Amino acid sequence: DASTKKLSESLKRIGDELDSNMELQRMIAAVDTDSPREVFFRVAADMFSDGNFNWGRVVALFYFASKLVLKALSTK
Amino acid sequence: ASTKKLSESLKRIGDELDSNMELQRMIAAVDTDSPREVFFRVAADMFSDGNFNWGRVVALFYFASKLVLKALSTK
Amino acid sequence: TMGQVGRQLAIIGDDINRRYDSEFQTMLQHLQPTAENAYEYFTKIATSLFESGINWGRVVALLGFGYRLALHVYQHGGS
Amino acid sequence: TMGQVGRQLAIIGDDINRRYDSEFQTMLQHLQPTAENAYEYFTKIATSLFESGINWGRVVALLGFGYRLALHVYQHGGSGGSG
Ligand SMILES: [C][C][C][C][C][C][C][C][C][C][C][C][C][C][C]C(=O)O[C][C]([O])[C]OP([O])(=O)O[C][C]N([C])([C])[C]
Ligand SMILES: [C][C][C][C][C][C][C][C][C][C][C][C][C][C][C]C(=O)O[C][C]([O])[C]OP([O])(=O)O[C][C]N([C])([C])[C]
Ligand SMILES: [C][C][C][C][C][C][C][C][C][C][C][C][C][C][C]C(=O)O[C][C]([O])[C]OP([O])(=O)O[C][C]N([C])([C])[C]
Ligand SMILES: [Cl-]
Ligand code: NA
Ligand code: NA
Ligand SMILES: [Zn+2]
Numbered sequence A: 001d002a003s004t005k006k007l008s009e010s011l012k013r014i015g016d017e018l019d020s021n022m023e024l025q026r027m028i029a030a031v032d033t034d035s036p037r038e039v040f041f042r043v044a045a046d047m048f049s050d051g052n053f054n055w056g057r058v059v060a061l062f063y064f065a066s067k068l069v070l071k072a073l074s075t076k
Numbered sequence B: 001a002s003t004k005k006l007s008e009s010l011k012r013i014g015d016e017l018d019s020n021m022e023l024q025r026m027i028a029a030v031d032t033d034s035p036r037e038v039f040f041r042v043a044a045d046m047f048s049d050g051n052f053n054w055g056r057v058v059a060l061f062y063f064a065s066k067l068v069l070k071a072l073s074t075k
Numbered sequence C: 001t002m003g004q005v006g007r008q009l010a011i012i013g014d015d016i017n018r019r020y021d022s023e024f025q026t027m028l029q030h031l032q033p034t035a036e037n038a039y040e041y042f043t044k045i046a047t048s049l050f051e052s053g054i055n056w057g058r059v060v061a062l063l064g065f066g067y068r069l070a071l072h073v074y075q076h077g078g079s
Numbered sequence D: 001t002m003g004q005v006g007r008q009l010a011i012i013g014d015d016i017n018r019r020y021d022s023e024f025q026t027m028l029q030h031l032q033p034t035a036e037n038a039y040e041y042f043t044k045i046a047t048s049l050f051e052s053g054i055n056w057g058r059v060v061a062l063l064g065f066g067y068r069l070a071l072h073v074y075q076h077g078g079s080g081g082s083g
Helices: A005-020 A022-030 A036-046 A055-073 B004-019 B021-029 B035-045 B054-072 C004-019 C021-028 C035-051 C056-073 D004-019 D021-027 D035-051 D056-076
Strands: none
Touching: A005 A055, A005 D004, A005 D021, A005 D035, A005 D056, A022 A055, A022 D004, A036 A055, A036 B035, A036 D004, A055 C056, A055 D004, A055 D021, A055 D056, B004 B054, B004 C004, B004 C021, B004 C035, B004 C056, B021 B054, B021 C004, B035 B054, B035 C004, B054 C004, B054 C021, B054 C056, B054 D056, C004 C021, C021 C056, C035 C056, C035 D035, C056 D056, D004 D021, D021 D056, D035 D056
């Protein structure tokens, strides 16, 4: 419950990759044909359909999903 | 420009979300493996009446954020 | 009998909206016109809240306000 | 086949995991034994990160670690003592 320098740098590099990743940005923009609820429903299962897990997939799903919430909210 | 009023407002909203026994009971009733399908259903069923406010949003944020936790507890 | 939990969750949300009406109004009073204006103020409110201690609910409310700022930018000011 | 988007996102995640292996490994090194210790530590890293400036991706990464902390407590929570 104290040392944070190294973790903070780690989160900056991961976070900056997600924030500037053109492919991830392109995918978020490609599902602007409505129902962000159903796309999340699908991608969430399909991305772990091979039985693998790592926290790169988690944060990728967090980022993609957090943008679908924005779009979902933009309908009211 | 100024945050203390907003800060206390966020404390009060958040503490209701954190201590609401009904909300906690619902989150605990959606164990049994499948958080993905439960969120899919609740997200749409919550707005089936055509109404919207940010009380529903934060309630859905809280409920959904706890389902993510449960989902992670399997993998 | 189809959509009970969702409607049950909607009821809780409506009750929260009513009881803490003034609190949600305070969120609308601090909306920002641009993305970086939203990131700055989001930073100040987050750090202020974190200085008071946090629990799961307090983080969700912060991210709720964060989406309130985000939605306003992702629709208006800063087009 | 079905689920092309999810697979693409899974591939991107694997690449992020690969390129930033050390960064993710660092996340597994600050685990906390209780919710209170996790809330304390989560607050310290969040405060440091916001002081360095933040973007959407940085907030997402912060919450990623948060769920790593929460998952540890939620599956393997302790009960104080070490202080
Ligand atoms: C992995 C991680 C990830 C996961 C997590 C996330 C969560 C999120 C949640 C939130 C979500 C929210 C949004 C929705 C909104 C609505 O409503 O939508 C429908 C419409 O459409 C509605 O419509 P109506 O109702 O019809 O109308 C409207 C009304 N007014 C009044 C507004 C106009
Ligand atoms: C659960 C986990 C999942 C993940 C997490 C979730 C949460 C998030 C955080 C909050 C967020 C913060 C608030 C503010 C921001 C803003 O503004 O917003 C608007 C626009 O819309 C946005 O901005 P930007 O993004 O930056 O811009 C756009 C992008 N580009 C591409 C253009 C750069
Ligand atoms: C987008 C929208 C939505 C949003 C979402 C996000 C939020 C944040 C999160 C992270 C946070 C992190 C920190 C904490 C950790 C811990 O610990 O954790 C555990 C559990 O388990 C919790 O704990 P507690 O709180 O202590 O508990 C509760 C109650 N019971 C029942 C569980 C006991
Ligand atoms: Cl929990
Ligand atoms: Na150090
Ligand atoms: Na070490
Ligand atoms: Zn653990």
